[PDB]
C-alpha cells in the first residue's frame, strides 16, 4: 500500500488509464482551482507531459502534492459538497441583485455587484463582478490593525486605542474616557494604528511593508493601488485633519510621530485596490487562524487574528454594527467603496461588492446578502452546531 | 454483532464477568455521575439486580446486555470517548488549577466566617465537575435576566420581544440612561430592559401564575436540580427599589410596556425573579442548556427555541458584565452574565456551561474571583469565540485527543 | 404752606371750589385706580359726603397725601402714563392676530390678556385680564422666592443648582453635583417645594403659600382650580419618576415624604390667578420685594434678587437662552398660557393667551415681549443714555 | 447771570481771586484727571497763563471765565456733583478696601505655559470719566481671552446682529456639553469660546488681507480706550502659534462643516486669531474700554460714539451668560455683571450705566479666572448694589455709591 496508488483508482473508475481531462474535472469540482499555489509542482509535472495517464505516470505527478489532493477527493474539506454550497451562494447573490436602493459615494464616480468566496481549505467560488478592482476604503482598517498587533502585540496596540464600540450617541466624539479613540474600525482609531506600523522608518517604505503584507494575505492575488482616490481623499479630508490635530493635541500618538505625515499614509492605505477574489482570500486568512488557505504560509499571529475578528464583530459596520452583531453574528467590515469583507471563522472568507450604499455607509446589496447568508446557513456565532432549527449546515454530508 | 456485547469487551478485559462496582467506576471517570436522569433505567436494572442474587455480584454479558440495553446509545459514546471533551479528567485537573488560581485574590467588597468560592461545569454531553462551595444556594440577581430573556423570546419570538427592548449596549458613557434613541430600554441585560421583558412573560394572567411559570421553566433548564427562592432578599430588595420604580415610572410615561400592563405590579414580579436561588451545580446545567442549542444536557428534553438561545447568548456577549462588557467581550469573548450575589453564568458554545460564585464584587459589580477565573479560562484553553480550532499558539484544546 | 393746600390749587384751576368728579378723573390719569389700597382713607372720607373747598379737601387727603403728591407732580416712574398704555394697546393688538399655536390638554372666542402694574402702583389692563387661569409653573419662582425668603440663599442651594441645563439637556434630572439644575424646571421645583415650611402638614403649607401669594398680589385675586389639580395628579407619571429618582439619589431634606411632596407640588401648579392679580406679584418682584400697591414688604431683597436672576437664565424652558438674548427680561411661562414678566425698577406684567408654541411658551405672550423691548429700552443691557431709535417711558418726552 | 460766573463763586470761597493750585485740586477731587481729553483745551489756557505773569498764580472772574468757557458744560456737572458717582472719594476708598481685601488670598497658579513680587492691579473708569487705579495698573499684559467680546462688538457693529449670528450662536454651552465645538444648528455655541471667537474673527472686514484687518481692530481698540495704551506682545504671539494644535483642530472641524463665510482661508484666520489674543493693554487702558461698554458705546473720556447700541447690548448680554468659562453660571448668579476673563490674568468688568473696570492678577484658579480678580468681583456686589437684579429702592444692607 500507500496513498499515491490508493488514490489512483478512486479517480480512475476501474480502468487502467485515465484521461487527464477527467483528473482536472474531478479536481475542479472539489472547489479547488487549477491555479492553486499548493498544486504547482503537480501540474508543473503535467503540462510538460503534453492523453491518458497510468499508475506509474500519475504517481510521480502527484506525489509531492498528494497529501492535499487526497482531501479534495475524499471530500474531507470543511465544505464537502461545494457544488451544493455555491448554487445557494448564487441563489443568495441573485435575490440581492433586485433591490435597487441607495446612492454611491458621490466623490468616486450598468451598475455593478459581485461576491466571492474562498474557504479555509482553499475552495473557491465567485459570481458577478468579482475581478473588477475597487479600493478597500475602511475595509483596510482591520488589516492594518492585524498587522499592527501582529508586529507589536495586544498590549502595545491598546496603549493607543480602545477596544469597544461608541454607542449611537458617539458618532461625533473622537476619544473615549481614557483619551484613546474608541476602537480600530472607526477613523480616529484607524489613524492611530496607522501611526504604529513600522515606526522610525519613512512613509514610502512603511507603505510598502503593508503592501508586502497584503500580498501575503491574498496568497499573492491582486492587490493594487488607485492614485485617483489617494489624491481625492487628500482633497476632502478636512475632517480627518481635525481628528489628527485633535489627537496630536491630546497626546495620543507614539512619541516622535509626524502627525500630518501619518495622515497622508492613512489616505494611501484607504485606496489600496483589491477585487472580491483577492479580498475573499485575505478574509479567508482571517477565517483560518492567520494561515493563508491557498498557500499554507502563516501570515498573522493567532493573537492578531483573534483581536481583529473580535472588533470587526462589535464595530465593523459603523452605526449598524450592533444590529449586525445581533442578526448575523459574523465578523465583517464595510468601506465606502461598496465592499464588505466577511469572515465565517473556521469555514470561509468572503468579499461582497456593490457600490450603492445605504444611509449608514454599508453596501445595500452587501447587507441584504449577509442577512440571507445566515438566514439559511447556521453560520451565526451563537448558533449551535447540534440544534439549529430550519437552516442548513454545509459542513456535513447530505 | 450488536452494541451491548462489544461494550462488554471494551470494559470486560477479556474475562467473562465484570464486578458491578468497577463498571460504574469506569463510567464515573467519563465525567457522568450515576445520578444522570438519562441513566436511571440503567441503574434501576442494576442495583435491584444487585440484590436479585445478592452475591456473585458480577455480571455476564447477558445480564449486562439488558441493564444497558435501555441507554446503550449514550453508554457507548461515554466509553468510546466520543464526548465533546473526551479526556474529561485531564480537563478537570486544569479547572482545579484555575479554581486555586483565583482562590488567592483577597480583593473585593460584598454587597450588604470564611471565604465563599465555587465553580461547577456541565458539558454539552452531561459531563460534570464541581469544586469548592458549589451546592450552597445563592440568588441569581441579574444572572436571571438572560434566562427570562430566553423565555420571553421562546414564547413570543424575536421580533415581538424587540418591539419593547433594544439589542445593543448603551456605551460606557451612557450607563446612566434608561432609554435609547427609539425610546426602548437599551438591551435585556440592564435593569430597565429586564424590567420591560418581565412585563412580557405571560400577559393577562396574575403575577403568582407567571412566577410559577418561570420556575417551571427554570427547573427544566436545570434538568430539575435545585431551583429555589429566598424570601429574605425579595423583601430586602422590595425595600430598596426606588431606582427601579424610577425606571418603572419613566417607562410607563414613555409608553414602554405592552398595552394593559400593571406597571407597579410588574416591578414586584421583577424583585421576585431577582431572588430565585440556585447553586453552582444547578445553574451549571442551565448554562449548559444555553451551550447546547436549548436542549437540557442531562435530560435530553427541548427547553428553548434555537432562535431564543442564540439571541440570549449573543446579548450575554455584548452586554453581560455591566460596565466591563466590552473589556470582557474582547479578552474572553464568552457569553456571560454576572449578578450582584456573586454569580457568573458562563457559556462556552458547543462545549459546556458553568457557574462560578464568589460574593465579593469589584467596583463594577462583577465577582472578583469569577473574573480572574474566566480570564485564565480562555488564557489557557482555546475557548475564545474567535480563536481557531486549527492554529491557536500555546493553548490547549480539551475537545481533542493528543 | 402745607401740601394739601399745595396740591389743592394745582387741581383747582384757580377757582376756590373744586368738583369731586374732576378730582377722580385727575387721579385716574396718573395711573392709579380709585381702589388703590393705600388710598382708601382718602376715598372713604369722601364717599360719605358736590364741590369742595380747601378745608373740605385738606381733611380728605391729609390721610394719604404723601402718595397723592407724586401722582399729580408726575414723579411716578412712568410719568406720562397714557403715552405708555397707548403703546401697550398697540403691543396688545399686534399679538392679537398671530393665530398659530395649539393649547395643551385642558378643557369659543379665543382669549388674550395683558396687565401691567408699575413699581409705583400705576395700573393698566387690556383684553381678558379678569378671567382666572392657573399659574402652572409660573408659580415656580414664587415658591422659590418664598423658600429663599424663609431659608436663605445658601440652604436653598444645598438642594438645587443655579444654572440652566444645556440646550441639550432638558431630558436629564440632575446636574453634576446631584441637584436638579435650577428652580425653574420641574425637577428643581419639586425639591424646593419640599423645603417650604418643613415639619408641618401639607394642608398647612399650602395655606402658608396662599397667605404669601395673597401678600404678593396686594390681596388681589388668587384662587384655585381643583379640575387642573386632578389632571396633574392623573397625568404625572413623569413627575413620579423624578420623585423616585431624586429620593433615590438623596436629594431631599431628611424626613421628606416624597409622594406627599408631589401631591403638594400638583396643588401649587393649580393655583388660579388673573393677569391683574399676577401683575402685582410681578411688580413685587420688580420692586425689591415690596408690593407696589400696599407698601408692604413681602420678600427679602436677597430673595427677589436670586429669583430675578434665574427667571432670566432659565425662565422659558428651552427658549430661555434666546429669550435672555432678545428681550433680556426676567420672565417665567407656564403651560396655562401665562407669562409672568418683570421689568426691574419699572413694572410687573402678566400676559395670558392659552395657545402655546411647541416649546411650551404662550405664542402671543412671546410675540408681546419681543415687541415690548423692540420698542422700549427695557432690555437688561440697554443703556439709559444712548438707545438708538426706541422709547424710554421713564422720562417726559 | 452767567454760566461761568456762578461756577466762579463756588470755588472762590468769597475771595476775589483763585489760585491755580486749588482750582486744580478741586477738579481732581471730582474723579476727573486733568489729562482728560475733553478738558485739554481748558488746561491749554491755564498753562499759558502760568507764564504770562510769572507770579501771582491767581485768576480773576473774566480770566477764569474764558479758560473754562471752552468746556463749561462738563466743568459744571463735575463741580455740581452731577456725576453718576457723586462722592467719588468715598467710592474709591471702598475700591481700595476691596483691592486690599483680595490681595492677601494666596490661592492660584499662573499660566506658566507662557511665562518675584506678586502682580495685582485694578482700574476703574465711570460712565462720566471719573478715574481711579491702585496697584499694578500701568503694566502691559495681553487681553488674551478678554478680547473675544471686543471683537464680537466690532463684528455686530460693522455687520448687524442677525448676520453675525448667522455664523455663531447666542447661548451658553452647558457644563455637560462644554467639550463640543458646535451646537445643534452647527454653529459654535457663542462668541466667548475659542470656537466661537475664531468664527467671529473670520467675519471682521472680509476681503482685505490679515495685516490690514489687524490694523483695523487696533484702530477700533484705540477708540474704545480713548487712545490710551493699546499695544501688542509678539512674544506671546509666538507662544500661541506653538500651542495652538487645539485651535487648528477647532479650525479644521469648522471648515469641514461649512462654518465660515464663503472664501475664508481658515488657516489664515487662525493666525489672525492668535494675533488678536496678544494685543497688550494695562488696567487703566482697558478700564476705559469696559466703560465704553458701560455707556451705550460712547467712550467716556472722549465723547465719541464707538459702537452701535445694538452691538454693546449683544456684547454685554453674552459676557453675562458666557464670560467666565465654566464659572459663568455661578458668576451670573452671585455677581450678575457682564464680564470676561482671559488667561493673562485680566477680568474686564462692566457695571452698566455706572463704570467699567479691569482687574489683573496673573495667577489663575482651576477654571482659568484670576483668583484675586474673582475675589474682587464677589466683594464688589457684596458691598454695592451693582448686581443686575438688585433694586435701586430697597436693597437691604448694601451701599449705593450712586447716591447722596
Ligand atoms: N433616553 C433618556 N432620556 N432621558 C433619560 O433620563 C433618565 C433618568 C434621569 N437621568 C439622569 N439625570 N441626571 C443624571 N446625573 S442622570 C438620565 C436617565 S433616559
Ligand atoms: N456638534 C458637535 N460638537 N462637537 C463635536 O465633536 C468635536 C470633535 C471631538 N470632540 C470630543 N471631545 N471629547 C472627546 N473625548 S471627543 C467634541 C468636539 S460634534
Round to whole Å and give the CA distance between B314 and B143: 15
- DSSP-assigned beta bridge partners for residue D298: D305
Contact across the interface for B253 and C245, Cβ inside 8 Å: no
D253 touching chain A per CB within 8 A:
yes
Round to whole Å and give the CA distance between B207 and B204: 9
SS3 for chain D is CCHHHHHHHHHHCCCCCEEHHHHHHHHHCCCCCCCCHHHHHHHHHHHCHHHHCCCCCEECHHHHHHHHCCCHHHHHHHHCCCCCCCCHHHHHHHHHHHHHHHHCCCCCEECCCCCCCCCCEEEEEECCCCEEEEECCCCCEECHHHHHHHHHHHHHHHHCHHHHCCCCCCCCCCCCCCCCCCCCCCCCCCCCCHHHHHHHHCCCCCCCCHHHHHHHHHHHHHHHCCCCCCEECHHHHHHHHHCCHHHHHHHHHHHHCCCCCCCCCHHHHHHHHHHHCCEEECHHHHHHHHHHHCCCCECCCCCCECCCHHHHHHHHHHHHHHCCHHHHHHHHHHCCCCEEECCCCEEEEEECCCEEEEEECCEECCCCCEHHHHHHHHHHHHHECCCCCCCCCCCCCCECCCCC
D252 touching chain A per CB within 8 A:
yes
Name the experiment that determined this structure. Answer: X-ray
Q: Subunits with at least 3 CB pairs below 8 A relative to chain D?
A: A, C
CA distances D327 to D198, D233, D344, Å, are 21, 28, 17
Q: Closest partner residue to D317 among C287, C304, C328, by Cβ? A: C328
Task: List strand residue ranges (DSSP E) for chain C, in order.
Answer: 18-19, 51-52, 113-118, 123-127, 133-134, 222-224, 271-273, 331-333, 338-343, 347-352
Distance D334 CA to ligand 1 centre (A): 28
The H or E element containing residue B355 is strand B352-357
Q: Is B177 in the pocket of ligand 1 (CB under 6 A)?
A: yes
The H or E element containing residue C150 is helix C139-151
Q: Closest partner residue to A323 among B168, B181, B385, by Cβ? A: B168
Task: Map out the domains of chain D as residue ranges.
Answer: 1-81, 82-404
* Contact residues on chain D for C300, CB-CB shorter than 8 A: 396
Give the three-state DSSP class for B335.
coil
A266 is in an annotated binding site: yes
Contact across the interface for A387 and B329, Cβ inside 8 Å: no
Phi, psi for D181 (deg, rounded to 5): -100, -30
**Residue B233 region by backbone torsions, left for phi larger than 0, else alpha for psi between -120 and 50, else beta:** alpha
CA distances B393 to A78, A145, A284, B329, Å, are 21, 19, 18, 20
With a CB cutoff of 8 Å and minimum separation 6, the contacts of B401 are B86, B87
- DSSP-assigned beta bridge partners for residue D232: D279
B253 touching chain C per CB within 8 A:
yes
Q: Is C24 in the pocket of ligand 1 (CB under 6 A)?
A: no
- DSSP-assigned beta bridge partners for residue A18: A53
B252 touching chain C per CB within 8 A:
yes
Going by the annotation, the residues of the binding site of C are 137, 186, 232, 239, 265, 317, 335
A240 is in an annotated binding site: yes
Resolution (A): 2.9
Contact across the interface for B293 and A386, Cβ inside 8 Å: yes
Answer yes or no: are the C-beta atoms of D387 and C302 closer than 8 Å: no
Are B and A touching by the rule of 3+ CB pairs within 8 Å? yes
Give the three-state DSSP class for C117.
strand
Count of CB atoms situated within 10 Å of the CB of A290:
25
Ligand closest to CA A188: 2
Task: List strand residue ranges (DSSP E) for chain A, in order.
Answer: 18-19, 52-53, 114-119, 124-128, 134-135, 224-225, 272-274, 332-334, 339-344, 348-353
Round to whole Å and give the CA distance between D382 and C153: 13
Q: Which three cell numbers stand for residue B139?
A: 440568588
Distance B178 CA to ligand 1 centre (A): 7
Amino acid at each position: 500500500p500507500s496513498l499515491e496508488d490508493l488514490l489512483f483508482y478512486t479517480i480512475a473508475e476501474g480502468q487502467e488509464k485515465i484521461p487527464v481531462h477527467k483528473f482536472i474535472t474531478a479536481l475542479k469540482s472539489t472547489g479547488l482551482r487549477t491555479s492553486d499555489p499548493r498544486l504547482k509542482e503537480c501540474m508543473d509535472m503535467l503540462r510538460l507531459t503534453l492523453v491518458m495517464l497510468d499508475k506509474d505516470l500519475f504517481k510521480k505527478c502527484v506525489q509531492s502534492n498528494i497529501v492535499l489532493l487526497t482531501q479534495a477527493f475524499r471530500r474531507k474539506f470543511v465544505i464537502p459538497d461545494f457544488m451544493s454550497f455555491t448554487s445557494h451562494i448564487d441563489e443568495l447573490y441573485e435575490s440581492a441583485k433586485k433591490q435597487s436602493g441607495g446612492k454611491v459615494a458621490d466623490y468616486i464616480p450598468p451598475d455593478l455587484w459581485g461576491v466571492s468566496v474562498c474557504t479555509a481549505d482553499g475552495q473557491r467560488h465567485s459570481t458577478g463582478d468579482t475581478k473588477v478592482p475597487f479600493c478597500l476604503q475602511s475595509c483596510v482598517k482591520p488589516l492594518k490593525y492585524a498587522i499592527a498587533v501582529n508586529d507589536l502585540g495586544t498590549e502595545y496596540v491598546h496603549r493607543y486605542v480602545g477596544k469597544e464600540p461608541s454607542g449611537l450617541r458617539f458618532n461625533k466624539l473622537f476619544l473615549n474616557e481614557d483619551d484613546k479613540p474608541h476602537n480600530p474600525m472607526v477613523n480616529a482609531g484607524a489613524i492611530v494604528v496607522t501611526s504604529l506600523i513600522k515606526q522610525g522608518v519613512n512613509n514610502a517604505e512603511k507603505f510598502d511593508y503593508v503592501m508586502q503584507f497584503l500580498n501575503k494575505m491574498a496568497g499573492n492575488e491582486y492587490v493594487g493601488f488607485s492614485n485617483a482616490t489617494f489624491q481625492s481623499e487628500r482633497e476632502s479630508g478636512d475632517r480627518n485633519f481635525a481628528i489628527g490635530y485633535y489627537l496630536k493635541e491630546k497626546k495620543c500618538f507614539p512619541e516622535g510621530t509626524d502627525m500630518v505625515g501619518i495622515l497622508d499614509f492613512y489616505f494611501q492605505l484607504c485606496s489600496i485596490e483589491v477585487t472580491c477574489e483577492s479580498a475573499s482570500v485575505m478574509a479567508a486568512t482571517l477565517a483560518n487562524g492567520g494561515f493563508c488557505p491557498i498557500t499554507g504560509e502563516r501570515v498573522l499571529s493567532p493573537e492578531a487574528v483573534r483581536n481583529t475578528l473580535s472588533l470587526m464583530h462589535s464595530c465593523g459596520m459603523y452605526d449598524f454594527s450592533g444590529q449586525f452583531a445581533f442578526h448575523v453574528g459574523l465578523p465583517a467590515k464595510s468601506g465606502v467603496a461598496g465592499g464588505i469583507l466577511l469572515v465565517v471563522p473556521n469555514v470561509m472568507g468572503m468579499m461582497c461588492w456593490s457600490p450603492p450604499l445605504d444611509k449608514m455607509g454599508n453596501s445595500v446589496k452587501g447587507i441584504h446578502f449577509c442577512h440571507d447568508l445566515v438566514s439559511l446557513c447556521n453560520f451565526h456565532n451563537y448558533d449551535n452546531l447540534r440544534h439549529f432549527a430550519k437552516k442548513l449546515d454545509p459542513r456535513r454530508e447530505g
